[PDB]
Amino acid sequence: NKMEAKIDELINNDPVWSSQNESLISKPYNHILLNFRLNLIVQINRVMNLPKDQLAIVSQIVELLHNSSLLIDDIEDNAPLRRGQTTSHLIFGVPSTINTANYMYFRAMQLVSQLTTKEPLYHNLITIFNEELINLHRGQGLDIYWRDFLPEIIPTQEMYLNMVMNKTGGLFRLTLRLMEALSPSLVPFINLLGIIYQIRDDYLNLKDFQMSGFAEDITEGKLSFPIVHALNFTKTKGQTEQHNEILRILLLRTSDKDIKLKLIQILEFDTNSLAYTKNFINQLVNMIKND
């Protein structure tokens, strides 16, 4: 009698969700919340001319996707720090962080319908959202597979660049394409910026450590731009031993500074991968500065 009634009031309503419940599961996200991406949206806008109301929502959407991606990336990469602070999954656990991060992807999708009331356009914005997230996951999927199944596949410079067009280019293209569709193409340019962004991120990760950083990419074992170069150069030049030692070090998932410094000096003096990467970056930057 009273039970059947309670159950009947239950199944005949939307599920109950409290602001307290909301707060409790947003902890991993609130943690990572502690302007440049915002600055990038603004400069792009000096061309896209979106009104401030909309620029604002484009921003909220991009921050949510961006922060969610990092929460997950740190789980995927087993990173202990992000922005000099302890990583969310280590504080709240992998379970909550994965769920909160995926939760936010969906809150992000929800925000898209606050951009328009035009059914044709809205459909377009969603397809953009859907497409760049699909691309993001593909790049990230390759990067993780190459790394976790090494030495199964040794990627070439070409493969690495295609993985980067997907992985990083994904959110760059997403932001700009939403804006371009909202404007009352800068895709190639934004693609080049993402590539430069990723190769500089790979490089400085070792160059900072070498100069003084943690070179956490070595610990992770990633097929970074410098590593891909060193791995193919050594294969090509008959340096069997170096090629193997590079792989062994990546596969140690080591935190020892000396072992990391040894790998880095291999890329500096033996394969010349650091100079190569440095130069490749400049060449890319000049492709713009000489536009």
Start-to-end C-alpha separation, the chain: 77
Q: Does 93 bind a copy of itself (CB under 8 A)?
A: yes
Residues 232-291 binding a copy of itself (CB under 8 A) are 280, 283-284, 287
Would you count residue 70 as binding ligand M0N (CB under 6 A)?
A: yes
Q: Is 222 annotated as a binding residue?
A: yes
The secondary structure element, H or E, covering residue 82 is: strand 81-82
Nearer to a copy of itself, 40 or 192 (CB): 192
Strands 81-82 and 85-86, sheet pairing: antiparallel
Nearer to ligand M0N, 141 or 151 (CB): 141
Residue 19 in the binding site for a copy of itself (CB under 8 A): no
Segment 205-234, which members bind a copy of itself (CB under 8 A)? Answer: none
Binding test (CB under 8 A) with a copy of itself, winner from 57, 90, 145, 200: 145
Backbone angles phi, psi at 135, to 5 degrees: -70, -40
Tell me how far, at minimum, the Cβ of 211 lies from a copy of itself, in Å.
27
Integer Cα distance of 291 and 289 in angstroms: 6
Size of interface with ligand M0N, in residues (CB under 6 A): 9
Contacts of residue 280, Cβ cutoff 8 Å, sequence gap at least 6: 199, 225
Report the alpha-carbon distance of residue 276 to residue 271 in Å, rounded: 9
* Least distance CB 139 / ligand M0N (angstroms): 7
Backbone phi, then psi, for 82, in 5-degree steps?
-155, 115
Residue among 174 and 215 whose Cβ is closer to a copy of itself? 174
Question: CB 254: neighbour CB atoms within 10 A?
Answer: 16
CA pair distance 99, 27, nearest whole angstrom: 11
Residue, CB closest to ligand M0N: 69
Report the DSSP beta bridge partners of residue 82: 85
Q: Which two tokens stand for residue 33?
A: 């919340």
Rounded Cα–Cα distance for residues 105 and 100 (Å): 9
Name which of ligand M0N, Mg ion, a copy of itself, none residue 201 binds, using a CB cut-off of 5 to 8 Å depending on partner kind: ligand M0N
CB atoms within 10 A of CB 272: 14
Task: Choose which of 88, 166, 271, 273 interacts with a copy of itself (CB under 8 A).
Answer: 166
Residue 92 binding result from Mg ion, a copy of itself, ligand M0N, none, given CB thresholds of 5 to 8 Å by partner type: a copy of itself
Residue 37 annotated as binding? yes
Integer Rg of the chain from CA? 22
Least Å distance between CB 29 and ligand M0N? 14
Q: Rule CB under 6 A: choose which of 69, 97, 242, 277 binds ligand M0N.
A: 69
Site for ligand M0N in 173-232 (CB under 6 A): 201
Binding-site sequence positions for Mg(2+): 73, 77
Which residues are annotated binding-site positions for isopentenyl diphosphate? 37, 66, 83
